[PDB]
């Protein structure tokens, strides 16, 4: 057992009835005195290091060639002047095991934290030394964290794509299904998580070229996609991850759900394909009134109306579908379906729940399309247009496939530096740069939507960490007040930066003129409701920072009207799995699952306390499972009212609560305006 | 006063070897000396034989003669574990670690090994001597079964535990620990049934039954010593294993309500280190807040 | 050719009574008429009594006389399911639906019932007649066992399946469906063991064993018709139950490798809704011609 | 039970110790006087029938519009003038259950045998009334039988494709793999059996752009193809059938074979994809000498040499592969691999065996490409060039994917009518028409190869029927002499028709100039060896027909040199599974499996005696399992010497014989020049 691992395991050993949290710090020192410095490759000067990394195909020549060597050296010096120290052993371990650049033999460390941050900053700035230094100060203060793809791969020649969330629309044809399989394989090859909408696909027992009972339904397509994702597994590094979304009014919805049951046969169950269910308000109304619902055959609806079932508003179309004899449908019990969803989420955490009307009643780009499905993490909610992939030697009709750009603000570090505006604007600029530098040659609709929509996702993390280190309970009304104010400022500065980029470049996102930004509707609740903190403690937390008022929001609305907005979407709160370790932050805006988490690496045990955990804030670091899920829903809705896309919202349940409690949480989330529900993790 | 709690414990302990992936032991197995691998294969083969007969013969025959549907259900469950779970798990281990020829050879070796044949002859003989409505013949077979569960398995269990305790062959070791956990409760349960019969006897009859139990233990013990030397001398562990089997002989006697027979000794500390959701319907009030 | 495959299917079907909550059946039980409640109780007691014979005698006696370690293990597993799982499940259903005094009276009635006794004792008689090392007597008992597993239970299963297909007594119906699924595989497996014996016989002996099987089927079938009218006339279902008996008799015959005896009939839709060549190395000079 | 069913079952009820074969005839009468005539749909005249079939989308109106109604009436009258009678109940039953056109609800019969033959002939003639009458006389005499796709689908609006088999080359890339999956689904949707060569795909543990041990090998692609064929299953009517072919020198050859082991795990086992193994002469030489062989990693060979492993001759490059340190290889025992092949074929009948050198030593188009794999029935052996399917928005390099049209000569009817020449030429014309009117819009390489190669497959059926009905034992040397003469005549007249078509159209197949037809090498054995019958009985059988001599072959060689050949490939002997029933013929050139076959249809059982089976020819209808497989190999080699493509050669084995006997049969087949071995069916 290594010395740093012993020093880390000494945390659980209680002295005077208290955990030895400070010992973790010592572990970090050991982890750097015994391992990191010994296995870190050192060079006589930075010029030699850069030459070795470029020549050995570690870095890219293009992004480094935009700067003189003096500017690169100045950026590296700015990164190293902070003298950044990892506060916990797990932060440094996760960085140097997951993100630090290693030799081809994987035994030496080529990149420190400062080196990786400097390289990512130089990639972000695209030739501006001052902008690169600003990015270096942003990331070394740990105010902003690029996502795992961006942070890991920026500036590296041997790399995947910087985007890892992809949403694909699948049209109801064999050509479109095969193209979707191909694109899923290509994007998993790039290292991205792929979500596919299967609602347009006709159900099982439908007609193919006017022969009856011929379609295999969406379950056969799910089997094909599951095989494709198993095959494309990042060159045998990570398990291929894919998601499939189906509307709850699709007839296959039960069989869809049956793919996640343990009792399902081998020809029914898909193991590497996550599933999500899109639930329109009509289904919730039918379940609430206990009226029996109807699941429709999509192809009959398409034949009758010329549009797909998921392309029209089910609230106004459901009665017409039911009363139409030419539309084929099957009787179901919506309450039974809700109970089945709750039971499946209890067993396996699936499916993801998308409340379609909750997403689309605040969607700014409904003119382009309504949000029909979400991503693999159930937080990307954007307009998508299906593509018509025709036969060979025939021109395809390329639509819009969602691929947003991830990046997370560290709420604790951002707010302690009183730099919400600067961090949000710099993160928006970096996300815009990464979106502009993304070029996928095997996903035509993804590339077209990236060029047109210019959608980015700016998330936040360390919400619970910040609240606990400031003596605020996550379920307290003060925490929701802080979340409201902080995320309203984040939205304000994100919109301001998007409008500034649109003014500078002279271009907005495609079909912006029809958006609620152009019409000013988006700013309605912002020009009438003041989002300043209602509690003195939160106001003192925001001291030293200008909180945008209704007049500031009116000025921003006028600015957007005059200049437009560059990004169709700006904010989405991703789970932030492993980057939260490196940043010493709690994951996403979720409450912490455990105060101290026990992990097993190799044959060794390691202990990670939550950041800033001590005896004084032990009570404020309440575990997520012990919390009331209604108050967690309230906080997530408070944040969601300022996020244009969704939030990865995992439910944290105890083994005692039943499926009725899960359904109640889901229905309260639907009532409170929650757009997506990610997971049902049972303790 | 006890069958229901044993029923619940037995069914809650239910497992299958396929739950444990064994390919993780491949390297620590490859690294053992030829002597070590030989002893290991033979040890598990001896265990397989014991469980084969405990499942095919011992547990079913005791089940037949014990009165009460719940007692029979426990004994039937234990019988199933012996041959459908325990005996089979050893083949899972063999099929992972060893080539077919080595597997064939070790099963041929059990057939011709004189100590293993002697112990099977003695134990199975007592099982087959049970006479209907004759509680004394039943007691004798239950003593034999306790000695199989709580004493005889242990010359075999030593070696997987010895490796597990050093961080070697830990997947196979996990299987063995599950088997051992089962046998411990099987030995206690059968011990309690034996005590029931013993407690019905006159003092004179009891004195004879203690003589039977002690004579049988000594006879099995002397044979087990020779078996232990035969297997463990090539790996240098015979004396250590002997201490372990004496320790477990005392546990078998205690399961039968008798005083320990061997003096306490220090056991190798390595071996000591080797040791749907509820559904409610949705009410109309759950849709309003 | 088949024991390992059946081993797999058996162990993967493992379940426990506690998994199904029974209390919610009281919400439909209270709405049944007296005749419906009476028939259900009587059918349930019939199944319980027959299944106890299978757990205490039928499966263990066959396991005793069949040669082969793997077959004995599968048979032990099946005996375990009868005694540890099925018997507890039937008891649980009873305790949920009736008070203690009502359960005792129903069992007293069914214990004295002429048609239940006739079939129970016919089957038990054949199990008691098995002789050591006599494969003919073993075959006859296997035929009896297949007839119980794949045929005699079904006059009883009809009613719970009938309710289950209508949305009534869903919790106990789920339990019955799991039990029935076990008995189906038990019948198929024992059927294959019987065919193995049958195929070892001369042509004259085969014809004699066929006559035995058909004669036995006829005796049991004629008693089933009487049993059926006795229980189901009061709820108007006997005609449809008779079709279900014949359909399951044909399945039992097919399990024994025999032709169907009865013409094909459709079944009540509510009940339906409820329901290696020798490897020889190349010796060289096989490449030259 | 139906009356005809009882009459057919009366065959096995022996009278005076003999089977009642004549009862079968009675059955047909019953089957027509009680079922077919009552279930047929009669119109006032042919005009109303044709109009009803055209407007109700049963028939394509284009092919019928090329004839005036008087010509169509004359063709139908020619078809009905023969007064064709089905001699067995099963012939009529199979036609009216599998090939006769029925209504949309399948309650009535719209097409008689004469109607189907007339429609197929009118489609074949393409506006020529005299040619349509010639086709009608050819098919009503049952001299020629179009394949099941062509016979069933010709002239139908709801038809699929007329091509039976498709062969795809899969390049070693994710884009090519995805395109192969798409094309396989498209062609299975069209109803054709798809064969894919997986020998170019790099093995398991190869590098995908410098990251090693990343590839899943051919087994992952096999699983993808298996799921694709499961999904595309002819709209749920016929199970999707695919074939995968791998060279025996591929490193994955064991894992490949492990896909068919009965003990294979679910993550490896493949159940709807047939497997074939391509064995060069080098492997047989290594196994014969007992020298340990080496399987190779295709990607290392491609990197070192610039060509794929299966793209070059292993007999000359195996030593270079072994001695090359930059080529990665694994040691295997070739005799153990042969024994594994024999064991697998005993257990499941797989893999198909393709003796590559036997195919390519007489292959006429080696200049275009060597034959590297076969079809799903292991009788199509043609040159194929792999396609380079590139990224989206990049032009793809379209290669040649094999596809040929099947058609079988009925040997008994052809020789009874003494019309080998006329039948062969008319069948060649019909297959040329089927190729010309075939246009597949989703398989580009298949379309290009169909347009360029112009390959057709002209098979033969009722070899054993003709031999047994003429008192010739199938294993006798007289039978092999008859096969030699008959198939030399078939080859002569097929080459003559191909050259005549090339002359009349002024065009040959692509790259004909480099073929052995152009250089005259193909005719060598035909201009030096006489293939006239050596037995007086066979010569009498061939009386009334001009058997080509060496002078006729020299004249044909000169004619080909002057005019060229229209078809790259002309003759391939398919299994002819179910269409042999309608023709009252034994399946293909294979010997009969059983004299009387008991088949269960619905709840009834029927007995089909072999065509012409009686007391006097009972022992001439020797069952295949009772025959010496060495003499069957001799027969198949004798036929194969005159067939440019392969023959679907099924091995018929007894349960008593060992895997060593199967290996001996395989090695004797390789020694005798057998190109492919189809199945190892054990009694
Ligand atoms: N907690 C830590 N986080 C990150 N790096 C660390 C940490 N502890 C030590 N290091 C690394 O080890 C070096 C030694 O740091 P130490 O605590 O011994 O003193 P120092 O005054 O920071 O040293 P130096 O002269 O290297 O700057 C640091 O410069 C840094 O590179
Ligand atoms: N074996 C058969 N094959 C094909 N069609 C048949 C067969 N048997 C009967 N039919 C059809 O059923 C009709 C019944 O007539 P059948 O053969 O009994 O003789 P028919 O009335 O004297 O006239 P004909 O033989 O001249 O058609 C036939 O005309 C024919 O259309
Ligand atoms: C992407 C991917 C490829 N492969 C295998 C199958 C293909 O035959 C093979 C080639 O993939 P390619 O698509 O050719 O990958 P590449 O072009 O980026 O890499 P290279 O330059 O080396 O050609 O890699 C996998 O096994 N799994 C995968 O996920
Ligand atoms: Mg379409
Ligand atoms: Mg490539
Ligand atoms: Mn045991
Ligand atoms: Mn035990
Ligand atoms: Mn039972
Ligand atoms: Mn049973």
* HEC-encoded secondary structure of D47-74: HHHHHHHHHCCCECHHHHHCCCHHHHHH
Residues D69/D47, Cβ–Cβ less than 8 Å: yes
Return the number of CB contacts < 8 Å for A and D.
96
Separation CA A573–CA A380 (nearest Å): 8
Rounded CA-CA distance B258/B264 in Å is 16
Burial of B110 (0-12, 13-18, 19+ CB in 10 A): middle
SS3 D397: strand
DSSP C57: I
- Segment C223-229 long-range contacts (CB within 8 Å, at least 24 positions apart): C223/C115, C223/C118, C223/C119, C223/C122, C224/C119, C224/C152, C224/C155, C226/C115, C227/C46, C227/C115, C227/C116, C227/C119, C227/C155, C228/C155
Which residues, at least 6 apart from C163, have a Cβ–Cβ distance to it below 8 Å?
Answer: C28, C40, C169, C173, C274
Q: With beta carbons less than 8 A apart as the criterion, state whether A194 and A242 touch.
A: yes
Distance C58 CA to ligand 7 centre (A): 23
User: Do A539 and A466 reside in the same domain of the chain?
Assistant: yes
Q: What is the CA radius of gyration of chain D?
A: 25
Which residue intervals of A506-585 are DSSP H helices?
Answer: 516-519, 524-528, 536-541, 550-563, 579-582
- C262: which DSSP letter? S
Report CA torsion sign: A558, A561, A567, A573. Answer: positive
Contacts of residues D44-53 at CB distance under 8 Å and 24 or more positions apart, as own/partner, are D46/D72, D46/D73, D46/D76, D49/D110, D49/D115, D53/D101, D53/D110
DSSP 8-state code for residue A591? P
Q: Which A residues 248-277 touch D at CB under 8 Å?
A: 266
As a whole number of angstroms, the distance between CA B235 and CA C224 comes to 66
Resolution in A: 4.5
Beta bridge partners of C141: none
Which run of H or E residues covers position D682? strand D680-682
Question: Tokens 């054995």 label which residue?
Answer: D525
Tokens of A457: 């996702």
Report CA-CA distances (Å) from A435 to A135, A156, A237, A649, D428.
Answer: 17, 17, 25, 25, 59
* Pairing state between β A293-296 and A329-332: antiparallel
How many angstroms separate the CA atoms of B79 and A246, rounded? 48
- Fill in the DSSP letter of residue A464: H
Pocket test residue of A29, A81, A115 for ligand 1, highest count of atoms within 8 A of CB: A29
From residue D327, alpha-carbon distances to D35, D219, D313, D333, D334 in Å are 67, 21, 16, 19, 19
A91 and A203 in one domain? no
Structure tokens at A476: 């307290």
Say how far apart CA C173 and CA C21 lie, in whole Å.
12
Backbone angles phi, psi at D380, to 5 degrees: -90, 120
Check whether residue D320 and residue D340 sit in a common domain: no
Q: How do strand A651-653 and strand A329-332 relate by DSSP bridges? A: unpaired
CA D456 to chain CA centroid, Å, is 10
Choose among D521, D523, D514, D528: nearest CA to D496. Answer: D523
* Structure-determination technique: cryo-EM
- Domains of chain B, start order: 1-275 (1.10.620.20)
C-alpha D464/C-alpha D469 separation (Å) is 8
Q: Which residues of A touch B280 (CB under 8 A)?
A: 658-660
Q: Let me know how many helices (H) and strands (E) chain D has, helices first.
A: 30, 15
Structural domain that includes position D321 = 281-333
With a 6 A CB cut-off, is A85 part of the ligand 1 pocket?
Answer: yes
Q: Domain ends where: D142, D176, D202?
A: D142
Element (H, E) at A608: strand A604-609
Structure tokens at D393: 């928005």
- In 3D space, the residue among A354, A345, A418 whose CA is nearest the CA of residue A380 turns out to be A354
With an 8 Å Cβ cutoff, are A236 and D213 in contact?
yes
Provide the β-strand partners of residue D406. Answer: D457
Task: Give the one of A224, A232, A392 whose C-beta lies nearest to D444's C-beta.
Answer: A392
Q: Dig out the tokens for A455 from the structure.
A: 């959608």
Q: Looking at the structure, do residues D566 and D681 belong to the same domain, yes or no?
A: yes
Comparing CA positions, the residue from A159, A192, A174 lying closest to residue A442 is A192
* Nearest residue of chain C to residue D285 (CA atoms): C287
Region of A163 (left: φ > 0; alpha: ψ -120 to 50; beta: rest) is: beta
What letter would DSSP give residue A544? T
Nearest Cα residue to A423 out of A583, A313, A309: A583
Peptide bond into B190 cis (omega under 30): no
Token pair recorded at residue B24: 């993780």
Q: Is A652 helix (H, G, I), strand (E, B) or coil?
A: strand
Secondary structure tally for chain C: helices H, strands E: 14, 0
Distance CA D92, CA D113 (A): 9
- Closest CB from D603, D659, D667 relative to C280: D659
In whole angstroms, give the CA distance from residue A251 to residue A298.
8
The most distant pair of C-alpha atoms in chain B lies apart, rounded to whole Å, by: 78
B113-133: burial string, b at 16+ Cβ within 10 Å, e else: bebbebbbebbbebbeebeee
Contact B280 A659 (CB under 8 A): yes
Shortest Cα–Cα distance, B166 to chain A (Å): 13
Q: How far is CA D518 from CA A674, B176, C251, in A?
A: 75, 75, 67
Looking at the structure, tell me whether residues D437 and D573 fall in a common domain.
yes
Q: Which of D610, D598, D606, D668 is nearest to D636 (CA)?
A: D668
Please give the sequence-ordered ranges of beta strands (E in DSSP) within A162-217, or none if there are none: 165-169, 193-197
Q: Whose CA is nearest to atom 9 of ligand 3?
A: D173
Q: Are strands D144-146 and D403-410 parallel, antiparallel or unpaired?
A: antiparallel
Q: A588: which residues sit within 8 A by CB, 6+ positions away? A: A408, A459, A460, A461, A463, A573, A574, A575, A576, A580, A647, A648
Residue A484 near residue A548, CB atoms below 8 Å: no
Q: Which residue of D has its CA nearest to A214?
A: D235
Establish how many alpha carbons lie within 13 A of residue D663's alpha carbon, considering only the half-sphere containing its beta carbon. Answer: 29
Q: Cα separation of D561 and A619, whole Å?
A: 96
Angstrom CA distances, B170 to B14, B26, D204, stand at 20, 10, 29
Q: For chain C, list residues whose CB is within 8 angstroms of any CB belonging to chain B.
A: 7, 11, 14, 16, 19, 21, 52, 55-56, 60, 63-64, 69, 72-74, 76-77, 79-80, 83-84, 87-88
Distance CA A516, CA C40 (A): 65
Contact A168, A195 (CB under 8 A): yes
Whether D474 and D339 share a structural domain? yes
Are B124 and B220 contacting, i.e. CB atoms less than 8 angstroms apart?
no
Residue of B nearest to A670 (CA): B287
Residue B26 and residue B159: Cα distance in Å, rounded? Answer: 17
Instruction: Based on the fold, state whether residues D110 and D217 are members of the same structural domain.
Output: no
Do the beta carbons of residue A300 and residue A328 sit within 8 Å? yes
Whole-Å CA distances, D438 to D124, D424, D455, D500, D510: 12, 21, 12, 21, 17
DSSP states of A353-422 as a string? EEEHHHHHTS-TTTTT-------TTS------B--B--STTS--B--B-----EEEEEHHHHHHTT-HHH
> What sign does the CA torsion over A69, A73, A75, A76 have?
positive
What six digits make up the tokens of C189? 């497996």
Count, residues in chain D: 683
Decide: A37 in ligand 1 pocket, CB within 6 A. yes
- Write the secondary structure of D545-596 as one string of H (helix), E (strand) and C (coil): CCCCCHHHHHHHHHHHHHHCCCCCCCCCECCCCCHHHHCCCCCCCCCCCCCE
| CB within 8 Å of D33: residues ≥ 6 apart | none
Q: Beta-strand (E) ranges in A59-205?
A: 144-146, 165-169, 193-197
Strands (E), D51-164: 144-146
Please give the Cα distance from D72 to D133 (Å, whole number).
10
My answer on whether A270 and A287 are in the same domain is no
Q: Which of A89, A121, A142 is the last residue of a domain?
A: A142
Tell me how far apart the alpha carbons of residues A679 and A275 are, in angstroms, rounded to a whole number.
Answer: 11
Buried b (16+ CB within 10 A) or exposed e, B83-93: bbbbbbbbebb
Task: Describe the crossing of helices C114-128 and C34-53 by its angle, rounded to 10 degrees.
Answer: 10
Which chains touch C (3+ CB pairs under 8 A)? B, D
Same domain, A347 and A315: no
User: For residue D575, how many C-alpha atoms fall within 13 Å in the half-sphere facing its CB?
Assistant: 16
The beta-strand segments (E) located in D491-565 are none
| Length of chain C in terms of residues written | 289
**CATH number of residue A511's parent domain:** 3.20.70.20
Domain count, chain A: 3
Chain A residues whose beta carbon lies within 8 Å of the beta carbon of residue D179: 182
Q: In this structure, are residues D27 and D4 in contact, taking their beta carbons and an 8 Å threshold?
A: yes
User: Are β-strands D403-410 and D456-461 bridged in parallel, bridged antiparallel, or unpaired?
Assistant: parallel
Residues A329 and A465 in one domain: no
Beta strand D680-682 with D651-653 is parallel
A322's tokens: 């039911």
State how far the alpha carbon of D277 is from the alpha carbons of C53, C148, D256, D645, in Å: 56, 50, 9, 17
Query: D 185-204 residues with CB below 8 A of A?
Result: 185-186, 189
The residues, ordered by sequence, that sit 6+ positions from A68 with a Cβ below 8 Å of its Cβ are none
Give me the helix-helix angle, B170-198 and B69-80, nearest 10°. Answer: 150
Positions of E strands within D297-347: 329-332
Instruction: Fill in the DSSP letter of residue D111.
Output: -
Distance of CA A36 from the midpoint of ligand 8 (Å): 64
Domain end residue (candidates: A90, A111, A142):
A142
Nearest alpha carbon, ligand 2 atom 8: D29
Residues A443 and A578 in one domain: yes
For residue D196, the SS3 value is strand
- Find tokens 């309440």 and name the residue: A622
In whole angstroms, give the CA distance from residue A418 to residue A451: 34
3-state secondary structure of D292: coil
Please state whether beta strands A406-410 and A144-146 pair in parallel, antiparallel, or not at all (unpaired).
antiparallel
The annotation status of A639 as a binding-site residue, yes or no, is no
Any CB–CB contact under 8 A between A604 and chain B? no
Q: Tell me how far apart the alpha carbons of residues A457 and A588 are, in angstroms, rounded to a whole number.
A: 13
- DSSP states of A214-280 as a string? --BHHHHHHHHHHHHHHH-STTTTS---EEEEEETTBTTHHHHHHTT-TT--TTT--SSEEEEEEE-
Cα-to-chain-centroid distance, residue C286 = 54
DSSP letter for A546, please. Answer: P
Contact A257, A334 (CB under 8 A): no
Q: Ligand 9 center to residue B141 CA distance, Å?
A: 29
Handedness of CA D106, D112, D115, D121 (dihedral sign): positive
| Cα A84 from Cα A142, distance rounded (Å) | 10
Is residue D371 within 8 Å of residue D359, measured between CB atoms?
yes
User: Which positions ≥6 away from C153 have C-beta within 8 Å?
Assistant: C47, C50, C51, C180, C183
Euclidean distance between CA atoms A141 and A144, whole angstroms: 8
Q: How far are the Cα atoms of A47, A139, A611, C136 from residue A36, in angstroms, in the given order?
A: 22, 21, 22, 77
Q: Do A220 and D230 touch (CB under 8 A)?
A: yes
User: Furthest-apart CA pair in chain C: how many Å?
Assistant: 87
Q: Are residues A131 and A169 in the same domain?
A: no
Residues of D numbered 421-460 whose beta carbons fall under 8 angstroms of chain A's beta carbons: which are they? Answer: 441-444
Q: Could you tell me which residues come within 8 angstroms of residue C149 by beta carbon, excluding any fewer than 6 positions away?
A: C54, C183, C184, C186, C187, C190, C252
């Amino acid at each position: 057992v290594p010395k740093w691992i012993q020093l880390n395991n000494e945390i659980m050993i209680q002295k005077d009835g208290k955990f030895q949290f400070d010992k973790d710090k010592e572990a970090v020192h050991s982890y750097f005195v015994d391992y990191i410095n010994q296995n870190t490759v050192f060079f006589h000067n930075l010029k030699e290091k850069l030459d070795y990394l470029v020549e050995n195909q570690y870095y890219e020549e293009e992004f480094l060639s935009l700067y003189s060597f003096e500017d690169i050296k100045e950026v590296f010096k700015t990164a190293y002047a902070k003298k950044f120290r990892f506060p916990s052993f797990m932060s440094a371990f996760k960085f140097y095991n997951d993100y630090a650049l290693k030799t081809n033999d994987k035994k030496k460390i080529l990149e420190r934290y400062e080196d990786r941050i400097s390289i990512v900053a130089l990639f972000f700035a695209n030739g501006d030394t001052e902008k690169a230094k600003e990015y270096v100060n942003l990331m070394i203060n740990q105010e902003y964290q690029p996502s795992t793809p961006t942070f890991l791969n920026a500036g590296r020649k041997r790399r995947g794509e910087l985007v890892s969330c992809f949403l694909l629309e699948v049209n109801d044809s064999l050509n479109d299904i095969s193209r979707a399989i191909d694109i899923s394989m290509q994007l998993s090859k790039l290292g991205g998580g792929v979500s596919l909408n299967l609602s347009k696909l006709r159900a099982k027992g439908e007609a193919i070229k006017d022969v009856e009972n011929a379609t295999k339904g969406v379950v056969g397509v799910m089997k094909l996609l599951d095989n494709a994702f198993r095959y494309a597994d990042q060159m045998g590094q990570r398990q291929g991850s894919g998601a499939a979304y189906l509307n709850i009014f699709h007839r296959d919805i039960n069989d869809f759900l049956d793919t996640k049951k343990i009792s399902a046969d081998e020809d029914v169950r898909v193991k590497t394909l996550s599933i999500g269910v899109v639930i329109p308000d009509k289904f919730v109304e039918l379940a609430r009134e206990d009226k029996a619902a109807y699941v429709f055959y999509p192809h009959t609806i398409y034949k009758e109306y010329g549009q797909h079932m998921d392309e029209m508003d089910m609230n106004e179309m459901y009665d017409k579908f039911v009363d139409n004899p030419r539309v084929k449908k099957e009787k179901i019990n919506p309450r039974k379906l809700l109970e089945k969803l709750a039971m499946l989420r209890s067993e396996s955490g699936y499916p993801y729940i998308m409340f379609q009307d909750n997403v689309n009643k605040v969607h700014a780009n409904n003119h382009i399309s309504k949000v029909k499905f979400s991503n693999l993490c159930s937080e990307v909610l954007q307009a998508s247009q299906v593509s018509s992939y025709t036969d060979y030697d025939e021109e395809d009709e390329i639509g819009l496939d969602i691929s947003c750009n991830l990046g997370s603000l560290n709420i604790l570090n951002v707010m302690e530096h009183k730099s919400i505006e600067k961090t949000v604007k710099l993160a928006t600029d970096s996300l815009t740069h990464v979106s502009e530098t993304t070029d996928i040659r095997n996903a035509p609709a993804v590339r077209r939507a990236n060029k047109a929509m210019k959608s980015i996702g700016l998330g936040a993390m360390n919400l619970h960490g910040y609240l606990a280190q400031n003596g605020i309970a996550y379920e307290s009304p003060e925490a929701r007040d802080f979340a409201n104010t902080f995320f309203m400022m984040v939205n304000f500065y994100s919109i301001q930066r998007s409008a500034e980029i649109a003014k500078e470049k002279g271009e907005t996102f495609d079909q912006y003129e029809g958006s609620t930004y152009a019409t000013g509707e988006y700013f309605d609740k912002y020009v009438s409701t003041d989002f300043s903190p209602k509690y003195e403690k939160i106001a003192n937390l925001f001291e030293g920072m200008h909180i945008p008022t209704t007049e500031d929001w009116k000025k921003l609305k006028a600015f957007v009207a005059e200049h437009g907005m560059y990004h169709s979407y700006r904010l989405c709160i991703a789970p932030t799995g492993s980057i939260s370790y490196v940043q010493s932050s709690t994951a996403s805006v979720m409450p912490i699952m455990e105060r101290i988490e026990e992990r097993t690496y190799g044959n060794s045990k390691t202990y990670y306390p939550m950041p800033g955990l001590a005896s004084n804030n032990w009570f404020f670091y309440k575990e997520a499972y012990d919390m009331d899920m209604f108050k967690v829903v309230d906080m997530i809705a408070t944040i969601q009212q300022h996020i244009d896309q969704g939030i990865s919202f995992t439910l944290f349940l105890k083994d005692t609560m039943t499926t009725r409690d899960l359904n109640r949480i889901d229905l309260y989330a639907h009532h409170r305006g929650i757009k997506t529900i990610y997971y049902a993790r049972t303790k | 006063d006890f069958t229901q709690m044993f029923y619940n414990q037995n069914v809650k302990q239910f497992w299958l070897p396929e739950e444990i992936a064994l390919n993780g032991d491949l390297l620590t197995w490859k690294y053992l000396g030829k002597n070590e691998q030989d002893t290991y294969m033979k040890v598990l083969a001896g265990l397989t034989l014991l469980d084969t007969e405990q499942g095919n013969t011992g547990m079913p025959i005791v089940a037949e003669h014990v009165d009460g549907h719940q007692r029979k259900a426990v004994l039937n469950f234990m019988a199933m574990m012996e041959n459908a779970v325990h005996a089979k798990s050893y083949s899972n281990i063999f099929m992972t670690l060893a080539p077919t020829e080595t597997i064939n050879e070790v099963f041929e070796w059990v057939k011709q090994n004189k100590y293993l044949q002697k112990k099977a002859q003695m134990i199975v003989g007592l099982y087959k001597a049970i006479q209907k409505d004759d509680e004394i013949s039943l007691f004798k077979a239950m003593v034999a079964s306790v000695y199989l569960e709580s004493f005889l398995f242990y010359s075999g269990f030593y070696y997987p535990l010895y490796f597990y305790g050093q961080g070697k062959l830990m997947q196979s070791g996990e299987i063995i620990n599950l088997i051992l956990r089962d046998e411990a409760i099987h030995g206690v349960y059968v011990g309690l049934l034996a005590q029931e019969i013993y407690n019905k006897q006159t003092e004179e009859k009891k004195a004879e039954l203690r003589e039977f139990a002690i004579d049988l233990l000594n006879q099995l013990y002397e044979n087990e010593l020779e078996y232990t030397e035969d297997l463990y001398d090539q790996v240098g562990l015979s004396h250590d294993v002997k201490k372990f089997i004496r320790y477990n002989a005392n546990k078998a006697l205690m399961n039968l309500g008798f005083d320990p027979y061997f003096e306490e000794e220090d056991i190798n500390p390595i071996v000591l280190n080797g040791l749907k959701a509820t559904v409610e319907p949705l009410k109309d009030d759950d849709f309003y807040f």
